[PDB]
């Protein structure tokens, strides 16, 4: 599924990402746009051998288990083929685990370079 901007914000806010670890809601929406284009099924295979899955591009070497990725830690205790749902529950829940503090969104390079310090609230404006 491909989410709309306000559809994703509303979903994410219900799931408690609004201000999670002092990260305002626009941060997460901004990160999803660049990472997955709001596409719950985006998958991108990395030259490092891992693959990134879902609306939040969760990694197969560290956070989820795809079965084809050597050195698999699967710290979110969830198969990657579960992070591709139309419900974002599994993806939000793994994101909550990944970001353990106020530097945690730096887990997404796209957020780091594109969204950090900009007017992220722009992303929820009108919702």
């Amino acid at each position, epitope marked *: 599924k*491909v*989410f*709309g*901007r*306000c*559809e994703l914000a509303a979903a994410m806010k219900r799931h408690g990402l609004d201000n999670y670890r002092g990260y305002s809601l626009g941060n997460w929406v901004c990160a999803a*746009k*660049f990472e997955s*284009n*709001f*596409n719950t099924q985006a998958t991108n295979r990395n030259t490092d051998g891992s693959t990134d899955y879902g609306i939040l591009q969760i990694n197969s070497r560290w956070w989820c288990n795809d079965g084809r990725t050597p050195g698999s830690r699967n710290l979110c205790n969830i198969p990657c083929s579960a992070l591709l749902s139309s419900d974002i529950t599994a993806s939000v829940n793994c994101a909550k685990k990944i970001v353990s503090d106020g530097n945690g969104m730096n887990a997404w390079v*796209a957020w780091r370079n*594109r969204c950090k310090g900009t*007017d992220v609230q*722009a992303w929820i*404006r*009108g*919702c």
Partner: T-cell receptor
Framework: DIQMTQSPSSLSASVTITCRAS??????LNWYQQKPGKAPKLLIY???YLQSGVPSRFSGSGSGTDFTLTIEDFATYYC?????????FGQGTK | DIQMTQSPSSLSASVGDRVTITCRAS??????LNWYQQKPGKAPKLLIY???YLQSGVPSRFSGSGSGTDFTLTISSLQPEDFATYYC?????????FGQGTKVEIK
């Protein structure tokens, strides 16, 4: 798709446009101005947030499903909702 | 803002021809680039989302590619109903910005 119906479709006028969404879009409604064979230019974001450079005679209003743009400026005007996939435009007012 | 440069400005070709339109963003916008089709008398309509995702009902002769700064829309078999102006639009940074458009005509 969320259908954006503008009215009226055309207007003659010498030196108020409506847009209606089929579904509740809250305030996620943008206004665009297009001159002939030119690209659309964004005038208003999120119902009423004017873009920098756009004069104050252009104001915007509304929430939910019924919205208004308020008026060199002979052009087509388009509403566009960008809160729900796929982003859609109304058919325009000339 | 981000400045989109689109080319060519117009083109004309024959039924069945392959045609390609390019869009260059003034900085890296990843895949946050859409293509709109505006038929005469009509509003712009989303044809391709995020560089390559075809919208439903759009025929498979249309496609798009690119990620970063340079993007392309290809019509693999031009048809008379494609008579339109095509716009790229980056929607990754506020405010959303359009290319200048490409009028496509069919002999």
């Amino acid at each position: 798709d969320i259908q954006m119906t503008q009215s009226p479709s055309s207007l003659s006028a010498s030196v108020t446009i409506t847009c209606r969404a089929s579904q509740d879009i809250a305030a996620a409604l943008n206004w665009y101005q297009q001159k002939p064979g030119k690209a659309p230019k964004l005038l208003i974001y999120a119902s009423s947030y004017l873009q920098s450079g756009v004069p104050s005679r252009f104001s915007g209003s509304g929430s939910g499903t019924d919205f208004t743009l308020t008026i060199e400026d002979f052009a087509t005007y388009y509403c566009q909702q960008d809160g729900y996939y796929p982003a859609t435009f109304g058919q325009g007012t000339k | 803002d981000i400045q989109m440069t689109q080319s060519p400005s117009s083109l004309s070709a024959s039924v069945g021809d392959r045609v390609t339109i390019t869009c260059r963003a003034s900085q890296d916008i990843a895949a946050a680039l859409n293509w709109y089709q505006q038929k005469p008398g009509k509003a712009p309509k989303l044809l391709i989302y995020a560089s390559s995702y075809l919208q439903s009902g759009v025929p498979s002769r249309f496609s798009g590619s690119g990620s970063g700064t340079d993007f392309t829309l290809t019509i693999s078999s031009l048809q008379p109903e494609d008579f339109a102006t095509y716009y790229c639009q980056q929607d990754g940074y506020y405010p959303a910005t359009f290319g200048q458009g490409t009028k496509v005509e069919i002999k």
